[PDB]
Amino acid sequence: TCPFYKKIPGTGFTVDAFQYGVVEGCTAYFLTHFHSDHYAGLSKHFTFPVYCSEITGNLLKNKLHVQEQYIHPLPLDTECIVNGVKVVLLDANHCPGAVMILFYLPNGTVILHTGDFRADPSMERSLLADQKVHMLYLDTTYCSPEYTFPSQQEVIRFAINTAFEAVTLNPHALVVCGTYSIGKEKVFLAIADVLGSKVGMSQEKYKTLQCLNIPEINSLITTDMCSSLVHLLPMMQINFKGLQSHLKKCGGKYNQILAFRPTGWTHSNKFTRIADVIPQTKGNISIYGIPYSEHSSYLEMKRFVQWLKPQKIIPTVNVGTWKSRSTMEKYFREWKLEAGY
Ligand code: NI
């Protein structure tokens, strides 16, 4: 059964609610982004309206085969009326196609649902600037001060310099990048760009990338592995066993692998600066874990909420334990006392 924090009061709308069967009284289902935890339940058999970004729509149609008559793409940054209610979709700075949703309720209440997001000071100059928000449905994935990580920009710089150095020292090294879902494409695109290569990958992954509206994409990716010295592999294969195995298939073209495993936060961010990071090594294989996050740091999230000044906050992540719920309510109260709302 559909939890409360996926329902939108005074509307017939749900958010990210495809795994509960038919939802009693839902006339339109919103999808914030194409990640498996949020889309779970959509298929060719779905026959209710789905509202989403254009990118999320290309994915539903081509990867899940949802029938075109039920896909309703909306432009960003644009007031739209859906079943008598004004809505706006805003960029969430998460993965390609990911949105937040503003709902302007018949009774005068204004609700922002963030979906999954990486809060940024640029969001302070979107359509949110105008006005009040009575309820915030907040992605609280990293709502604790111990969660610190660098900017995306610094992490890409480290990856670019690391790869360029290794291949310049050794023209016969292969670079491998792990992936399991959409998001974090900048890691493998930036490395391929500095090395003058296309990124090689499986037919299924190429298909997914082709749905993402990345300009000049045909110039950047390929299914011909032999013509590429940056390869994409499923994340689970990014280990010494998986990588040795891959090296055999390449036909004695290469004598070294350097691989990158993009992660979220890990405990070694407590102690090690991005500059100081070092790989796990076995023979001619090296593996770098790099903390490329598509979710707000604690500091980013605090800044966004203190700017927005919402009347009430409903968390959508870490809601399963009394301790988590209690801890999150305590941070929301300090933030409110500190900033004066
Ligand atoms: Ni997500």
Curated annotation (Swiss-Prot):
Full-protein residues shown here are 700 to 1040 of 1040
**Induction (free text):** During mitosis. The mRNA encoding this protein contains an internal ribosome entry site (IRES) in its 5'-UTR. This 5'-UTR generally suppresses translation while specifically promoting expression during mitosis, when cap-dependent translation may be impaired.
Task: Tell me the organism.
Answer: Homo sapiens (Human)
Q: What transmembrane ranges does the database entry give?
A: none
Where is this protein localized, as stated in its record?
Nucleus
Similarity comment: family membership: Belongs to the DNA repair metallo-beta-lactamase (DRMBL) family.
This one is known as DNA cross-link repair 1A protein
Q: In which tissues is it expressed?
A: Expressed in brain, heart, kidney, liver, pancreas, placenta and skeletal muscle.
Subunit info here reads:
Binds constitutively to TP53BP1. Binds CDC27, which is itself a component of the anaphase promoting complex (APC). Binds PIAS1.
* Function noted in UniProt: May be required for DNA interstrand cross-link repair. Also required for checkpoint mediated cell cycle arrest in early prophase in response to mitotic spindle poisons. Possesses beta-lactamase activity, catalyzing the hydrolysis of penicillin G and nitrocefin. Exhibits no activity towards other beta-lactam antibiotic classes including cephalosporins (cefotaxime) and carbapenems (imipenem).
Q: What is the lineage of its organism?
A: Eukaryota, Metazoa, Chordata, Craniata, Vertebrata
